[PDB]
């Protein structure tokens, strides 16, 4: 079993065996990292909001609504940025607005 398997490493040197262990470790995590670059999730979106000056309660409502209108792909902190500038209010006020159910027909463009 293990002796059969270990065939091709047996004459690998410690430097080769180590560099090979990390070489493959790297190739295994890469697809994971890419998935991480091109995609988003609710907790991530909520966290962007928290940093943007929103409370956990307010953040939930925006992301809960963002998901309904199918807008995750654009970014929840982005929905709150474009609506802030468009209607000329503070990031905070336009984020409160949205949380409460407002400016959602508008955000869709």
């Amino acid at each position: 079993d293990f002796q059969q398997r270990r065939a091709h490493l047996a004459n690998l040197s410690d430097e080769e065996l180590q560099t090979r262990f990390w070489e493959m470790a790297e190739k295994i995590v890469d697809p994971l990292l890419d998935l991480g670059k091109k995609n988003t999730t609710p907790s991530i979106e909520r966290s962007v909001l928290l940093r943007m000056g929103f409370s956990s309660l307010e953040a939930k409502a925006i992301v809960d609504k963002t998901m309904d209108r199918g807008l995750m792909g654009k970014g929840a902190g982005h929905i709150v940025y474009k609506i802030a500038k468009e209607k000329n209010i503070s990031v905070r006020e336009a984020g409160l607005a949205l949380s409460e159910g407002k400016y959602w027909d508008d955000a869709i463009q």
Partner: protein, 578 residues
């Protein structure tokens, strides 16, 4: 400001004005090496700077109460359900050498899909919120000036809202955290695609805060039948999270492996666990070694726990350990008591000091049976890695039950934990980033289209808003309480009474628990039941047995009992001379 070594911590005062508290510093601190240090008549080779205020070892009386401190950062874990009582157990550990205070999340926090707020009571752990975290970190600021050496507050960044708590930890100067997206999948059955996409953010936020990161490969140590056979997979779980954390942006010097010697006597545990310890440290150079102690092969005996732990400290000394966490000797007897967190520190400090300079005098026989097994474990792990690629990536390997299988890999029993790619908690919560996706904040990982609004701001996204909370703390929404009857102010009010009577406690103020040890001249079962009676007559309540040991079948039985004293004493009616 404030803090007299003879006055208790005013936990009533620490809880006030938490809306205006700010962490005093950020990130991890290590111990300052103190070269050829002279304490009393002795010279120490492997010591760190002395504490300004501390409780030295009982036997330090024969030597002028000297209190030598070793080089590794020393962890103790304290989380009872009531963060407010524990702030006192913290102060006792700090005095005993612990400079890494680690706090367990209330049962099920992994599944909280968002932060919680305020201070409800915990179950088998503290509920981690901002008030509570600001509280404990404010108390540690005091406690660390008292002792004269910084203390790393640590907690957990797991769950379906890891990224959430990463922020809050970043804001509130939590110094260290666990972060390993493999924990979510294997033990909490959170969905793997969302779990790993989340860890990218989680980890970035953590790297921004300069926090230290501990992984959870050691978890596979416990949930595992014959722990010595798990050694190829440990290397695999340590490697995945490390190369991952590394490529996210985290510094190699802030990435800690959580490495526990898998065995304990009567196994020849040194012989078994040492090649592994060496293999790991050779294969992971430049990464940190956070040694933990044995919990799986534990039982009701404190004595036994301690001896196995000293052997655990011995694995660390023979090799290397940047942090040396501890486990209470009573871990298998009950939920840790004040006196036993302190035993854990004392013992860790005592053993390390007694082995000062040991490696100037001893060494590893690096060729022999040792190097052979160091080589074999390495091969077995590389093999495991080869098969995870062949099967076409990490998700497929998980789904095929590659992990948590009780076989000494390449051996596979089929008893491993299989999660579905498309299933779990949080399935269907991944969303594709669109071309014009943006996020106006520091510490964001994935694709962030910033150019569109300003080509210049690409590397400072938060300047679209004149600072995210990481630059502008005053933008942090602070919640105080969200429950009127379940919070710290009710709990503290409940017992104003006590702050001029007194009673014994193990975890919570005046909980009335005590420990009784006795010997009975009869077999165990009977001995045990006869034992309850004696305790009852002694006026204790809620009596239960927590340890039986056979001295010899017929001759005798040692019994140990935890029980509640149903009354108080008065410090003012105690006749005390000089």
């Amino acid at each position: 400001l404030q803090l007299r070594v003879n006055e208790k911590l005013d936990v009533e005062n620490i809880l006030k004005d938490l809306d205006k508290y700010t962490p005093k510093r950020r990130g991890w601190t290590w111990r300052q090496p103190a070269e050829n240090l002279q304490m009393g008549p002795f010279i120490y080779k492997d010591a760190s700077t002395p504490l300004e205020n501390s409780v030295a070892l009982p036997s330090a009386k024969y030597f002028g109460d000297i209190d030598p401190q070793p080089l590794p950062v020393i962890t103790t874990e304290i989380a009872s359900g009531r963060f407010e009582d524990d702030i006192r157990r913290m102060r006792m550990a700090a005095w005993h050498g612990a400079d890494h205070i680690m706090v367990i999340r209330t049962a099920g926090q992994s599944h909280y899909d968002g932060l919680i707020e305020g201070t409800p009571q915990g179950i088998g752990g503290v509920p981690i919120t901002r008030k509570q975290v600001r509280a404990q970190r404010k108390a540690l600021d005091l406690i660390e000036e008292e002792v004269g050496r910084p203390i790393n507050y640590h907690s957990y960044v797991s769950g379906v809202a890891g990224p959430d708590i990463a922020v809050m930890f970043a804001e509130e100067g939590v110094n260290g955290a666990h972060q390993d997206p493999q924990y979510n999948v294997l033990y909490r059955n959170i969905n793997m695609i969302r779990s790993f996409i989340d860890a990218c953010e989680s980890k970035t936020i953590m790297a921004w805060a300069d926090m230290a990161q501990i992984d959870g490969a050691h978890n596979a140590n416990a949930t595992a039948r014959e722990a010595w056979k798990v050694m190829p997979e440990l290397m695999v779980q340590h490697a995945l999270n490390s190369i991952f954390s590394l490529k996210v942006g985290m510094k190699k010097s802030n990435i800690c492996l959580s490495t526990v010697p898998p065995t304990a006597p009567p196994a020849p545990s040194m012989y078994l666990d040492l090649p592994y310890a060496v293999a790991l440290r050779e294969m992971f150079e430049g990464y940190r070694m956070r040694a933990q102690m044995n919990t799986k092969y534990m039982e009701a005996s404190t004595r036994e726990a301690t001896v196995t732990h000293v052997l655990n400290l011995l694995i660390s000394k023979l090799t290397r350990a940047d942090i040396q966490s501890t486990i209470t000797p009573d871990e298998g007897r009950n939920v840790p008591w004040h006196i036993y967190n302190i035993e854990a520190c004392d013992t860790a400090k005592q053993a390390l000091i007694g082995m000062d300079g040991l490696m100037d005098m001893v060494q590893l026989k690096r060729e022999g049976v040792l190097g052979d097994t160091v080589r074999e474990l390495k091969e077995r792990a590389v093999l495991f890695m080869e098969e995870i690629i062949e099967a076409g990536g990490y998700f497929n390997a998980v789904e095929q039950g590659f992990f948590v299988d009780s076989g000494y890999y390449p051996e596979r029993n089929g008893d491993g934990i299989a999660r579905q790619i498309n299933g779990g908690i949080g399935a269907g919560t991944v969303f594709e980033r669109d071309e014009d996706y943006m996020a106006p904040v520091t510490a964001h990982f994935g694709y962030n289209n910033v150019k569109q609004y300003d080509e210049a701001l690409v590397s400072e996204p938060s300047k679209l808003i004149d600072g995210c909370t990481l630059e502008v703390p005053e933008k942090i929404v602070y919640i105080d309480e969200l429950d009127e009857n379940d919070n710290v102010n009710v709990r503290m009010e409940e017992t104003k009474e006590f702050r001029s009577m007194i009673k014994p406690e193990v975890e919570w103020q005046a909980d009335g628990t005590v420990l009784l040890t006795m010997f009975l001249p009869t077999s165990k079962r009977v001995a045990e039941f006869a034992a309850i009676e004696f305790a009852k007559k002694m006026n204790l309540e809620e009596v239960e047995v927590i340890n039986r040991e056979v001295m010899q079948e017929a001759e005798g039985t040692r019994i140990e009992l935890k029980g509640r004293v149903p009354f108080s004493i008065d410090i003012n009616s105690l006749v005390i001379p000089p």
